[PDB]
């Protein structure tokens, strides 16, 4: 059994469009100085003529706000907000699948029990990002009890989501 | 055999002028918390009269954007964008060679297999920076196969590049 989301989701969170994915914890320990980071792998040719194959570019996940330093004790849903400075700013539902790209996700931290440091890498190909979905919750707050269902760790349902590019959605908003 | 670019290149990338150099990976392991940083070594006398010999100054390589935290699994081309806040802002092709300076490049990270931490330092003297060149690609995307040719790791070709100072190029752009 493993702990890292399989698919990624895109949908609305308080008006803004967001790219989301879950990240799993460790049963046998707490991770110190844990940090989540995510790169965007995708070839692109500079108008300048130079063709960079698999150029990488960083993806906002809370670097500026410090919200990329995780307190992982329970599965977390990392949420990228899709803004002007997002590489998906101009990508829409129908536009998604026909993108020749990939998202790498990297989790670093120093394990406590083991006194060693970990790095768990993973990826998502265009055909692994799900537009218009949200993650099934996996944390129920029972009577004086908080509990996770790792049986629903990957489970995702479908939600009403406009098929417009983040940029377009913000353009209509102005009107 | 080694893994760190010999010469550095300067040319255009989407309009902006950039100082570039390649950085090699490790065959026998992945590097965690890898970070690339680069200093600018060069003596300068303050108009104030004090002469600082080999004063050092940091060089933008993605600190602000977080793009200085590398995911190194394949040779990467670190690209410094030459802006107002670049120490090369006012340096042009013909101006380059006659500069009494040096660029130090430092790569830090914790190795996985070895469970030790590395620091690979290197430099470039004025006579080791190549104006108007780009790095030969070293990553071909064969039929269901990505591959590097470390035989072309240092190989560099010549490209059309204006012999103006970054500042000047931006001044003409305004007109």
């Amino acid at each position: 059994t493993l702990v890292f989301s399989t698919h990624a989701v895109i949908s609305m969170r308080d008006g803004k469009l967001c790219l989301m994915f879950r990240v799993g914890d460790l049963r046998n320990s707490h991770i110190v100085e844990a940090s989540i980071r995510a790169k965007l792998i995708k070839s692109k040719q500079t108008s300048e003529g130079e063709f960079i194959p698999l150029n990488q570019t960083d993806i906002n996940v809370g670097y500026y706000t410090g919200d990329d330093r995780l307190f992982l004790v329970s599965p977390l849903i990392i949420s990228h907000e899709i803004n002007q400075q997002s590489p998906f700013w101009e990508i829409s539902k129908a536009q998604l699948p026909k993108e020749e790209l990939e998202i790498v996700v990297i989790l670093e931290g120093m394990v406590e029990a083991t006194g060693m440091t970990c790095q768990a890498r993973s990826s998502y190909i265009t055909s692994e990002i799900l537009w218009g979905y949200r993650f099934t919750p996996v944390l129920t707050l029972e009577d004086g009890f908080y509990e996770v269902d790792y049986n629903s760790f990957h489970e995702t349902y479908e939600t009403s989501t406009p098929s417009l590019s983040a940029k377009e959605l913000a353009e209509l908003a102005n009107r | 055999t080694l893994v760190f670019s010999t010469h550095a290149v300067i040319s255009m990338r989407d309009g902006k002028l950039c100082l570039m150099f390649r950085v090699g990976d490790l065959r026998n392991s992945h590097i965690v918390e890898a970070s690339i940083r680069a200093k600018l070594i060069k003596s300068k006398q303050t108009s104030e009269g004090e002469f600082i010999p080999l004063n050092q100054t940091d060089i933008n390589v993605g600190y602000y954007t977080g793009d200085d935290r590398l995911f190194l699994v394949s040779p990467l081309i670190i690209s410094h964008e030459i802006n107002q806040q670049s120490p090369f802002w006012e340096i042009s092709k013909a101006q380059l060679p006659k500069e009494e300076l040096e660029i130090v490049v430092i790569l830090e990270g914790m190795v996985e297999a070895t469970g030790m931490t590395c620091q690979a330092r290197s430099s470039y003297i004025t006579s080791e920076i190549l104006w108007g060149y780009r790095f030969t690609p070293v990553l071909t995307l064969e039929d269901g196969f990505y591959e590097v040719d470390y035989n072309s790791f240092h190989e560099t070709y010549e490209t059309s590049t204006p012999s103006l100072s970054a500042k000047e190029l931006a001044e003409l752009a305004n007109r």
Partner: peptide, 17 residues
């Protein structure tokens, strides 16, 4: 399209030495 990185975490290979 072929991956650069695999779900498990391993990359895609080189030829040197």
């Amino acid at each position: 399209i072929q991956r650069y990185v695999r779900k498990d975490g391993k990359c895609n290979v080189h030829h040197g030495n």
